[PDB]
Design a protein around this ligand. Structure first.
Ligand SMILES: [Cl-]
Length: 162
C-alpha cells in the first residue's frame, strides 16, 4: 500500500458494468509506452461476483491483436483492496468512485510498489470528464508517476483505444 487514498464504504456491487479507461499513469515510463506495454490495459466491464470477488474484463495489446482478457480480483478483508493472482500478488486499490461517473483505481505490486504501480481514471461514458481527470491528478500529485496517457472520445470507442 504505497497509495495513501482509498474508498471508504465501497459497494463493489455498485461499480458493476461498463467503463472506459480514459486516463492512465504509471510510476515508470516503460509500463505504458507502446500498446504492448505490460500495464497498457483498457477496462471494458467490471463484474463483481456474488461471493464479492471482482471480474475485470479488459482489452490489451497482445501481439498484433487487441486481445480481450478477463482478470479475477479476489476480495480481501479491506472492502476497497482486491488481490489479482499471482506472478507476484498484486493489489488493486479503489481510491474514489461515484459509481455513476468515474472510478479511480491503481494496481501496484506488493513486492515492488514504487518501481511498478499504475493508476487509472475510468469513466462511465465515452466523454472527456475534466472533473474526473482533475480528481485523478489530485490523487497522483503524491505518487511517483512518470508517464501520463490521456485519450480522446473517438479513441475510447475503438478497441485498444486506436
Ligand atoms: Cl465527427
Amino acid at each position: 500500500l504505497i497509495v495513501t487514498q482509498t474508498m471508504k464504504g465501497l459497494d463493489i456491487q455498485k461499480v458493476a458494468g461498463t467503463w472506459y479507461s480514459l486516463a492512465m499513469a504509471a510510476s515508470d515510463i516503460s509500463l505504458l509506452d507502446a500498446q504492448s506495454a505490460p500495464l497498457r490495459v483498457y477496462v471494458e466491464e467490471l463484474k463483481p461476483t456474488p461471493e464479492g470477488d471482482l471480474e475485470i474484463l479488459l482489452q490489451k495489446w497482445e501481439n498484433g491483436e487487441c486481445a480481450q482478457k478477463k482478470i479475477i480480483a479476489e476480495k480481501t478483508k479491506i472492502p476497497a483492496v482486491f488481490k489479482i493472482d499471482a506472478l507476484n500478488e498484486n493489489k488493486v486499490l479503489v481510491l474514489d468512485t461515484d459509481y455513476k461517473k468515474y472510478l479511480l483505481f491503481c494496481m501496484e505490486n506488493s513486492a515492488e510498489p514504487e518501481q511498478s504501480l499504475a493508476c487509472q481514471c475510468l469513466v462511465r461514458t465515452p466523454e472527456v470528464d475534466d472533473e474526473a481527470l482533475e480528481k485523478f491528478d489530485k490523487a497522483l500529485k503524491a505518487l511517483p508517476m512518470h508517464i501520463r496517457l490521456s485519450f480522446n472520445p473517438t479513441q475510447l470507442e475503438e478497441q485498444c483505444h486506436i
